[PDB]
C-alpha cells in the first residue's frame, strides 16, 4: 500500500481545522500579543511532530513536501500525467 507510511503530513495540519475560526474573534486578546508571551507562545516546542508550522504540503500518494493547495488540494505538477481528469482550475500548464 505505502499510503499510511507516506501520510506523515496528513495528521499534522488536521486537528487544528476548526480550533481558531470561532475563537480568534472572541479571544483576540489571547491570540494577539499585547506587547510578550515568551512562555505561553513557546509551548509549541513540546509537540515535535504536529504543529501549524509543520505544514509540508500533505500528499498521501508519495509523502513528499510538494503538491498541495489550501483552496482544493489539487495537483500542480502531477497534471502532466493527469491533465485529462479536469482537476485544473486556476492553475494550468503554461503553453498558450
Amino acid at each position: 500500500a505505502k499510503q499510511s507510511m507516506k501520510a506523515r503530513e496528513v495528521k499534522r495540519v488536521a486537528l487544528a481545522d476548526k480550533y481558531f475560526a470561532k475563537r480568534a474573534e472572541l479571544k483576540a486578546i489571547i491570540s494577539d500579543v499585547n506587547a510578550r508571551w515568551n512562555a505561553v507562545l513557546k509551548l509549541q516546542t513540546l509537540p515535535r511532530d504536529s504543529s501549524p508550522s509543520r505544514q509540508r504540503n500533505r500528499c498521501r500518494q508519495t509523502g513528499r513536501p510538494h503538491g498541495f493547495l489550501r483552496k482544493f488540494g489539487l495537483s500542480r505538477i502531477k497534471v502532466r500525467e493527469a491533465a485529462m481528469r479536469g482537476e485544473i482550475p486556476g492553475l494550468k500548464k503554461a503553453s498558450w
Partner: peptide
C-alpha cells in the same frame, strides 16, 4: 484570456 502565458 483564460489562465495562460505571460502574454497568452
Amino acid at each position: 484570456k483564460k489562465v495562460g502565458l505571460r502574454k497568452a
